[PDB]
Amino acid sequence: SLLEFGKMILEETGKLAIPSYSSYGCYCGWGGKGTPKDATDRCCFVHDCCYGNLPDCNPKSDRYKYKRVNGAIVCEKGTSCENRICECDKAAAICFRQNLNTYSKKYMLYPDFLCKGELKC
Numbered sequence: 001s002l003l004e005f006g007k008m009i010l011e012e013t014g015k016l017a018i019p020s021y022s023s024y025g026c027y028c029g030w031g032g033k034g035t036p037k038d039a040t041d042r043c044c045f046v047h048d049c050c051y052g053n054l055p056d057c058n059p060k061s062d063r064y065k066y067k068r069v070n071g072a073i074v075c076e077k078g079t080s081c082e083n084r085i086c087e088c089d090k091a092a093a094i095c096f097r098q099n100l101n102t103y104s105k106k107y108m109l110y111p112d113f114l115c116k117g118e119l120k121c
């Protein structure tokens with residue numbers, strides 16, 4: 001659920017999910033359309049696509065368990081939806097960490113009309 005995902009993001013990047021990643025670019029937050037603005041926005045796009053492969057799961061509210069093995073994120077065994085949701089979130093948190101150097105505040109609160117284009121998962 002968003003509770004685990006937010007904690008994962010803070011641990012990984014030092015930034016608070018909200019406000020740092022809830023209104024960033026075209027895909028971090030709201031849903032999504034257009035071309036990702038940058039690497040961090042692409043992390044969100046892929047994350048949305050990852051959730052997209054789990055039609056009968058509920059990523060935002062279904063809670064899962066995960067632990068840290070010397071920094072490494074390890075998803076603990078739960079239901080099948082929980083396992084897959086955790087893997088999607090783990091991937092995004094790492095992607096965010098990997099692109100911290102290019103994170104740009106000019107993409108915070110990015111306006112909707114500037115998200116033009118096509119990008120299928």
Ligand SMILES: O=C(O)CCc1c[nH]c2ccccc12
Binds near residue numbers: 002006022029
């Ligand atoms: O409801 C969600 O779509 C947006 C609010 C939200 C809570 N925790 C988050 C962690 C990362 C990105 C967005 C969020």
